[PDB]
Amino acid sequence: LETGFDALANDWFTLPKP
Amino acid sequence: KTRYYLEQCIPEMDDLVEKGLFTKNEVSLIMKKRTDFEHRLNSRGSSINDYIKYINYESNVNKLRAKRCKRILQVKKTNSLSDWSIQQRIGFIYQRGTNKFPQDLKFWAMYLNYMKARGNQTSYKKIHNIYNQLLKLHPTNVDIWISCAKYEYEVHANFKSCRNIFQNGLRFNPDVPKLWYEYVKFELNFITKLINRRKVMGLINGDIALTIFDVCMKTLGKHYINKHKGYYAISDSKMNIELNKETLNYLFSESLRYIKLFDEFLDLERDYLINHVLQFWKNDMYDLSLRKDLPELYLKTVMIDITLNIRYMPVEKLDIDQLQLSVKKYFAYISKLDSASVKSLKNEYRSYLQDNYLKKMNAEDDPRYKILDLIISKL
Amino acid sequence: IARVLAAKAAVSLRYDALAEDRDDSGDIGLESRAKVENRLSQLEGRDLRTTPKVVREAKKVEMT
């Protein structure tokens, strides 16, 4: 059985201004 | 509440000064560094690296205390609070760190490795609690499920518990082929040890895995269909056929892995186990016939069947009758295969015989060599 | 730079447009480019804000 867990240890709403 | 942690260390410090291991000036230095770490952990922006640093610092203090015990006290263990104080404290930091940052698998791994090292101090029951809590937070990480499965089958050799781990893990993650692979690997390991123990018993005086294989094949197929389809079904018939083909190739590669797995276990009847896998693929699946729709996969199935009887026969024990059976199988499949497939199945079979038997036999001393060369020529 | 670049563009453009025996090299444009870059360099090297100078306070000295 192999586990890496152990190895893991070590704006849209603005109008144009005239 | 940083101060409340500070009084908890006072009884330890008084013990250190009382035993004479550490001077008041030195003990003051220890308290100053602990004070900084306690502030760091309780402040905003605290990270797991702060917990690791404090754990590392406490470990060094434990080492220094131990050597000063033999150096000054000249005793292996002084019966006082100082002996188990650091070890108890380090576990407390781990508990706080894991609770604060359940995401970090790195800190969980250090927590388990640290305690498994001190098996005497930390009972295996507490280890189960950590594995229990970790599994709840991350049920979908198969690596954790195998870790407690592996730990309880090696350290404790409790096969009953380890089976429950795999049963529970597969329940949460039935779509991960890796977890099924390891569970079968565990299953065959138990049988091999059990048979070896039976062999030892006589000296001093498996199908179950295939069922796990079969259900693995079905469930992985379902989830692979659930993926690649999303919320909705696929209307077009041609795509649905392509999805069926994807599962077959996906499952066929997965089954091929189990075929490779069987080879490792010498004690078990690998030919019997492999023949069941061949029988599984002979059945029509998802309305697609391997012979018609996926001849390339069918050819590999035919090759394994042809070489099944002679796969594990050593060169020394090669039986001519068994070889004849292999060739008789090979000719039978040719009559039912297309010309292109026959040439492909042909070239593979010649290389198999040449590499495994002809190249490892002495041409001058073995009479079987001429028969093999003649068969290879005639094939 | 737009005023300078436009002036040098006309010089280069007129060389291109009205040439009986122009070489396809761009030598006039290249030399014109160097002039505009030199104009840019000195113009950019300018500092509009006045530089402050080293203050030298003649601090009162009383004997000890």
């Binding site: - | 690649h228 209307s235 077009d236 | -």
Partner: protein, 102 residues
């Protein structure tokens, strides 16, 4: 001399602008037409050419699991489209529909 006629320049620059406009309209049609199948792509990948290439590499959201978009997209973008593919709101399309969109 055939190499010193300006009228090619005036036509080429006019043609270049025309190609930019037309290519833009075809790109919008592809985004809307293919957006029916998978509407989330346009927000992820804005470039029209990169958008079209994703269709060519993978025609259906199902293919997103195995198809690799490394040469078209960076790593972080290519995984975003894969996640979007399965959780998309779009509907399936036929090969006949797929062929013309390709």
């Amino acid at each position: 001399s055939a190499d010193k006629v300006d009228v090619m320049i005036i036509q080429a620059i006019a043609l270049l602008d025309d190609l930019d406009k037309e290519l833009n309209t075809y790109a919008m049609r592809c985004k809307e037409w293919y957006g029916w199948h998978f509407p989330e792509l346009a927000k992820i990948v804005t470039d029209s050419v990169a958008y079209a290439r994703i269709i060519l590499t993978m025609g259906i959201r199902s293919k997103a699991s195995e198809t690799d978009l490394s040469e078209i997209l960076p790593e972080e973008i290519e995984e975003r489209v894969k996640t979007a593919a399965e959780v998309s709101m779009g509907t399936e399309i036929t090969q006949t529909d797929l062929d013309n969109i390709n």
